[PDB]
Structure 1
Amino acid sequence: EVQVQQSGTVLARPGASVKMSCKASGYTFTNYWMHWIKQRPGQGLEWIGAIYPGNSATFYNHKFRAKTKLTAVTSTITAYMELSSLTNEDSAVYYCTRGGHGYYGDYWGQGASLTVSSAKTTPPSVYPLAPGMVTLGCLVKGYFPEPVTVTWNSGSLSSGVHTFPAVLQSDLYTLSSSVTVPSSTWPSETVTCNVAHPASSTKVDKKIVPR
């Protein structure tokens, strides 16, 4: 049916430039506008600009005229957006959307995440979170880049697990995961969280010990 296919995740350093693309499927590329939208973690949505591939007319948000360059290749049915002089503020998820008369986005792409960082790949420090039903946790502190996976007892403990979204403390991420088990079960049955960080090929198991 209609499909707006986006490029994947990008990691870039301050001062660089990146090119993102959106490929159309299911319609006449030249009769519609392609708009680009920025979603910053909790800064809402911002419109960057739009291109009409039929004749490459463009509209830009004034704020982004120095940052973005929009293009489209009508044989390849691809629109591109180039962002120059990346700063930390350009870290966001970007969407391309299909627009027409009176609207900017009836069909949306899936988003491309862009992180602009000066950090080096860093493995997590994993700390056990005992109290002393009971809730146990693990803190996965100080890793770069995303993601880390957390399992509990190599996957056997699947019920009552909550792994939270990572926050950025300094330029490194911190996330935690909790598991709630019946009080009779612990410490009798060992509970261990297993943290894997593929970018630094780290795999660490931390047994939760009563304090």
Structure 2
Amino acid sequence: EVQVQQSGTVLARPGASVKMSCKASGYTFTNYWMHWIKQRPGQGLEWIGAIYPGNSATFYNHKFRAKTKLTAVTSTITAYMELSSLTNEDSAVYYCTRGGHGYYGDYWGQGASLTVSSAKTTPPSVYPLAPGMVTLGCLVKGYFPEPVTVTWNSGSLSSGVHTFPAVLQSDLYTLSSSVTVPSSTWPSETVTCNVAHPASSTKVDKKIVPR
């Protein structure tokens, strides 16, 4: 039907430049505007600018005029946005959206995450969280880059599991996961969290032991 296909995740260092792209599917590219939207974590949505491929007209937000360059290749039905001199403030999810008269985005792309960091690949430190039904946790501290996967007892414990979104503390992520089991179950039945950090091929298991 109409589809707006975006490029993948990008990891970039401060000072660099990246090019992101959006391919149109299901409509006449040259009759619609392509807008770009920045969404920061908790800063809301910001409009970067728009390009009209048919005649390559553009509108830019003044704030992004020094940062962005929008282009489109009609034979390839692709729009691009190049961001230069990346700072940490450019880490965000970027969307391209299709616009027309009076509107910027009836159909949206899926987003492309950009992270700008000086950090190096770091494996997680995994710490068991015991109280002393019961809730047990694992803290996965200080890893870069995202993601880590957490399972409990090799996947056997699936019910009552909560893995929370990672926060950034310093330039490394921290995330935790909890499992709630019947109090009779523990410590008789061993509970272990399993953490995998593919980017540094880390796989570590942590048995929760009572305090």
- Tell me by how many angstroms 1:107 deviates: 0.1
2:112 is equivalent to residue 112 of structure 1: yes
1:2-48 deviation line (CA, Å, top 9, x unaligned): 00000000000000000000000000000000000000000000000
Secondary structure in structure 2 of the residue aligned to 1:27: coil
| Cα distance in structure 2, aligned partners of 1:75 and 1:101 | 23
2-structure distance, mates of 1:160, 1:56: 53
Q: TM-score, normalized by length of structure 2? A: 1.00
Name the counterpart of 1:77. Answer: 77
Per-residue deviation, 1:168: 0.1
- Partners in 2 of 1:161 and 1:68 — Cα distance? 42
Q: Distance in 1 between matches of 2:127 and 2:77?
A: 49
Report the Cα distance in structure 2 between the residues aligned to 1:93 and 1:186, rounded to whole angstroms. 41
Helix, strand or coil at the partner of 2:206: strand
Runs of 5+ consecutive residues of structure 1 not aligned to the other structure: none
Aligned-partner Cα distance in 2 for 1:183–1:174:
28
Name the CA distance, whole Å, in 2 between partners of 1:70 and 1:50: 8
1:1-211 to structure 2, matched below 5 A, reads 1-211=1-211
What SS does the corresponding residue of 2:11 show, helix, strand or coil? strand
Aligned residues: CA RMSD: 0.1
In structure 2, how many angstroms separate the alpha carbons of the residues matched to 1:132 and 1:74?
64
User: How far apart are residue 148 of structure 1 and its match?
Assistant: 0.1
Q: Distance in 1 between matches of 2:56 and 2:186?
A: 65
State the secondary structure of the residue aligned to 2:146.
Answer: coil
CA deviations over 1:55-109 (Å, ceiling 9, x no partner): 0000000000000000000000000000000000000000000000000000000
Per-residue deviation, 1:206: 0.2
Helix, strand or coil for the counterpart of 2:107? Answer: strand
The structural deviation recorded for 1:199 is 0.1
Structure 2 counterpart SS, 1:93: strand
What are structure 2's unaligned runs of at least 5 residues?
none
Q: Give the Cα separation in 1 of the matches to 2:40 and 2:136.
A: 32
Structure 1 segments of 4 or more deviating over 6 A? none
CA distance in 2, matches of 1:83, 1:105: 21
2: CA distance, partners of 1:91 / 1:97: 19
What secondary structure does 1:63 align onto? helix
